[PDB]
Amino acid sequence: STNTFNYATYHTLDEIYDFMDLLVAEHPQLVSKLQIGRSYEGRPIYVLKFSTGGSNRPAIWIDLGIHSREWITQATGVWFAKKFTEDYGQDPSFTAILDSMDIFLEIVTNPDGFAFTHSQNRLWRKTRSVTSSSLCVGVDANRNWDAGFGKAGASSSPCSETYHGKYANSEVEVKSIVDFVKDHGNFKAFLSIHSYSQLLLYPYGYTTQSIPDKTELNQVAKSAVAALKSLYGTSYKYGSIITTIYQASGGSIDWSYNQGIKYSFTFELRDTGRYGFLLPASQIIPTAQETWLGVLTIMEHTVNN
Ligand SMILES: [O-]
Ligand SMILES: [Zn+2]
Ligand SMILES: [Zn+2]
Fold first, then answer.
1. Is 268 among the residues known to form the active site?
2. Ligand 3 geometric centre to CA of 303 (Å)
3. What count of other Cβ atoms lies within 10 Å of the Cβ of residue 23?
4. 126 lines ligand 1 (CB under 6 A)
5. Where does substrate bind?
6. Which ligand has the nearest atom to the CA of 244?
7. Cα 174 to ligand 2 centre (Å)
8. Which residues line the annotated binding site for Zn(2+)?
């Protein structure tokens, strides 16, 4: 049961996939599992849909683990999934959100790379797509989106960790999300989870031009970092991607924002470099707890209060 599943340790790809089947079996009144595509190697790509009814209700997209090595993200996603099922009908605020909006959660956005971090390279970041012309494998899925694709902030060299691929959406793991979100057409928030650095970022990453909704998103971001900090005092910096980290092209939130999805944010979770990607399992639950308060604040702003 999801009640005996250990949320305080890291899991394999199959354990997480089995957890998904368990959650759907236990809470059919709220969650269902969708296969939106298959990875380069043929692994199914799954999205959990949380909904209380309706026809094409406004939605919130949340993806985790696009960069496979960022294990704290998939772990936070599993906990989030459990959280949603416990809080509905309990937390008055979250209850109002699910009563008028659907939440789409993608725990393992890059399954091939995730399997690879467990079998061969713990620090693997990219997908596992093969390019016959190179001995190097993979494309950085967060440089593959049609948002300033091929511009500064990504590399054209296949061996680079930030290789953008041959063309925008070349990676099936990316195309499957683009297609799904576009066909859906009613997403109001697009949240992508990463690690590490402790930053809450909004568009743009590919250009220094300010998004027209700059002042609003910056206020929402300030509110979200305040709420997250309240719990354990964890401090986050926030701002546009280009001014807060560096210029980065072909990123997902830049693409989602240009698709009319206003509340597009990227979270860079714990820590700031002590452990980096190898965050100890003892910090899983705490990280998941604080990030939740931050995420919820953004959602309340999308239902509009
Ligand atoms: O990242
Ligand atoms: Zn990342
Ligand atoms: Zn990052």
1. yes
2. 28
3. 23
4. no
5. 67-70, 125, 142-143, 195-196, 246
6. 3
7. 14
8. 67, 70, 194
What technique solved it? X-ray
As residues whose CB is below 5 A from the ion ligand 3, the structure lists 194
Parallel/antiparallel/unpaired status of strands 102-106 and 44-50: antiparallel
**Ligand 2 centroid, distance to 95 Cα (angstroms):** 30
Q: What is the resolution of the experimental data for this entry, in Å?
A: 2.0
In single-letter form, the type of residue at position 132 comes to S
State the total domains in the chain.
1
| CATH number of the structural domain spanning residue 269 | 3.40.630.10
- Determine if ligand 1 sits within 6 Å of the CB of residue 67: yes
